Amino acid sequence: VSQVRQNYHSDCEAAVNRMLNLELYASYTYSSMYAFFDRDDVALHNVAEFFKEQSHEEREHAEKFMKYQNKRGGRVVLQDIKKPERDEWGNTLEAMQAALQLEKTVNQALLDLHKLATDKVDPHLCDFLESEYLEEQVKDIKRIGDFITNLKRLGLPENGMGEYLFDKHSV
Amino acid sequence: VSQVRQNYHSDCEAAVNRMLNLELYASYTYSSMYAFFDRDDVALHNVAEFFKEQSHEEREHAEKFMKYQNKRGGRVVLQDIKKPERDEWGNTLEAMQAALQLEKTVNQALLDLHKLATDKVDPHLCDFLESEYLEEQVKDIKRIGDFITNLKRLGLPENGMGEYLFDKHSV
Amino acid sequence: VSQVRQNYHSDCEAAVNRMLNLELYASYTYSSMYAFFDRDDVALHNVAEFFKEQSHEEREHAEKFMKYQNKRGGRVVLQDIKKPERDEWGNTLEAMQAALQLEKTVNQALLDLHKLATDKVDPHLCDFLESEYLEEQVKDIKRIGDFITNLKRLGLPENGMGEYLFDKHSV
Amino acid sequence: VSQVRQNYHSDCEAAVNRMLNLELYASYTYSSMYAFFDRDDVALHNVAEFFKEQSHEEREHAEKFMKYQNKRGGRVVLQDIKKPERDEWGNTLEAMQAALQLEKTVNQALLDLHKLATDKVDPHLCDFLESEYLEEQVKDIKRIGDFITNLKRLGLPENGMGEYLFDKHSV
Numbered sequence A, B, C, D: 001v002s003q004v005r006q007n008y009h010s011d012c013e014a015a016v017n018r019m020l021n022l023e024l025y026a027s028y029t030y031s032s033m034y035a036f037f038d039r040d041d042v043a044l045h046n047v048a049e050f051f052k053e054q055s056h057e058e059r060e061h062a063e064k065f066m067k068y069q070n071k072r073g074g075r076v077v078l079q080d081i082k083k084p085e086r087d088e089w090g091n092t093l094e095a096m097q098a099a100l101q102l103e104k105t106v107n108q109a110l111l112d113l114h115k116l117a118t119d120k121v122d123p124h125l126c127d128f129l130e131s132e133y134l135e136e137q138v139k140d141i142k143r144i145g146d147f148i149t150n151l152k153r154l155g156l157p158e159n160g161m162g163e164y165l166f167d168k169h170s171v
């Protein structure tokens, strides 16, 4: 037993490791979206950079879980980072729709972890999730939803002019 | 009944007073460690100053509970501050081990208070503990654990050179 | 065929994708080393931060290959990022030895890619590898070798004082 | 034989002169595109200025070959600069398509020169081409390809609004 460990359930420790992996998975998916929008036959640079930024943010989320694990006396256990679900992302609307679903998947995992922490009476873990993850998730989901509404308004997927306009005025 | 009092259970009010006393007790223990390491036959000034800083921090924790009590309309009730468990602290490793146990004792009391606040449906008290106490406790416990690992690596208690090196490069 | 593609062999495109994956694998291995040295029972913070920095550098190397692929009109294809070979890294010497071998593995892959680029008469790819990868590899290998020599001089793995001294004066 | 001449094959000297001429030809083509987009019945000023900038860049490329020739002890031999293939350039998409093909033609000539330099075992000439020409070519080709993708997305050649938008947000 780690000398620092106090009120940290084995189940929570394991769930933190799984959450870390999911953050890394999300990062990798966003990196794929970056590379797609940087393709010469796609060429939406501001969209690409948005997803690149998101990729870096997700990596930061993962690293914060690593630090958390050690602070509580848990042990970081890593697993493979699975490649993204797709190799190409269609267009800005399709990519944003996938990003929304990804963000909701990550959010659900965070909420499930919060429920576990609650069940195990771990207020430190609850506080950590609330203060460092849950509000950022809601903000990101709202931003992506707002983008999707605008992409639909702009006539995506069919309206190429609309897609250009979004890249030039929304990101 | 205090004109400001709302959703503040008598049990929580009493537990806040006991928590205040424990913070003062912790402060006093750290002050003893400061004085020990400042002895001419001990003479580890950086270690002494670390514990002096910790003593002041614990006093601040106590004063914040006093302010909290009044904000909620509870009444501060003071008890004797018991002298520390020991009059001399052996060496840096022994002192750090005692500090770790002290920090875990304080942490357990904070967690118990959080559980009481939860049982009494007092989200303000829960928030206060989470935002002002629980993360600082985890950080401090991790720091002391890290120090202990390094002191053991440096050959404490036997290795006087190791102890000197710690004082000169870790604190 | 991509409108930008010129003098870019399919074999080189595929090898760039595999190289990208290897950079990501190296990044992930370094992230594991960071987490290990941040453990409360390991607690070598400067060593941990060295490996964290290395992890970020490797990720940058991977992203540069993504950008390269697109610049040439190749298509980024991602695969799983395999978890590191180990879950725990022993001590500073063992970790540095693994880092040296990892760096040499990455270097060999870069040299193999340079040989392929040479065989396919692709001077742009040769230049890219020489200007952006090969010298950094040699520098990193030399730095790690130098560290290993010093860790051995300091009596690793047995000499805990030596390990402490390295953390405090070399990184 | 020039007193400075060393390891500089006659074939390479001649090929450098031909490369110089091609750079001047490219410059002149871009100058024609500038003048076209500055016409009152075309009036896409940002597009015109892009091509004017490209024209100046190509002239700089030519002058660098002149300096190179002298540095190696070769002799600059000039030929007529042929007028561009066209007198009018249709629209932004047509001009960009011609620019892409021009850039690929120049790139192929640079790659052919690099192959000659390799065959004649001239590493100085290889280095010069790699460090001063080949990466700039790849960057320029990618930029123009990206523009073409966006012009097609914007409905060129038919969509005049799309063409206006490109001029106002892409260049």
Ligand SMILES: [Cl-]
Binding pocket: A005, A006, A007, A008, A009
């Ligand atoms: Cl526990």
Ligand SMILES: [Cl-]
Binding pocket: none
């Ligand atoms: Cl699987």
Ligand SMILES: [Cl-]
Binding pocket: A088
């Ligand atoms: Cl595709």
Ligand SMILES: [Cl-]
Binding pocket: A146, A147, A150, A170
């Ligand atoms: Cl928007």
Ligand SMILES: [Cl-]
Binding pocket: B005, B006, B007, B008, B009
């Ligand atoms: Cl009340």
Ligand SMILES: [Cl-]
Binding pocket: none
């Ligand atoms: Cl008593």
Ligand SMILES: [Cl-]
Binding pocket: B088
């Ligand atoms: Cl004594």
Ligand SMILES: [Cl-]
Binding pocket: B165, C165
């Ligand atoms: Cl020293």
Ligand SMILES: [Cl-]
Binding pocket: B146, B147, B150, B170
């Ligand atoms: Cl330390």
Ligand SMILES: [Cl-]
Binding pocket: C005, C006, C007, C008, C009
């Ligand atoms: Cl090709």
Ligand SMILES: [Cl-]
Binding pocket: none
């Ligand atoms: Cl496999």
Ligand SMILES: [Cl-]
Binding pocket: C088
């Ligand atoms: Cl272990």
Ligand SMILES: [Cl-]
Binding pocket: C146, C147, C150, C170
């Ligand atoms: Cl060293």
Ligand SMILES: [Cl-]
Binding pocket: D005, D006, D007, D008, D009
């Ligand atoms: Cl010669």
Ligand SMILES: [Cl-]
Binding pocket: none
């Ligand atoms: Cl002729």
Ligand SMILES: [Cl-]
Binding pocket: D088
């Ligand atoms: Cl005309």
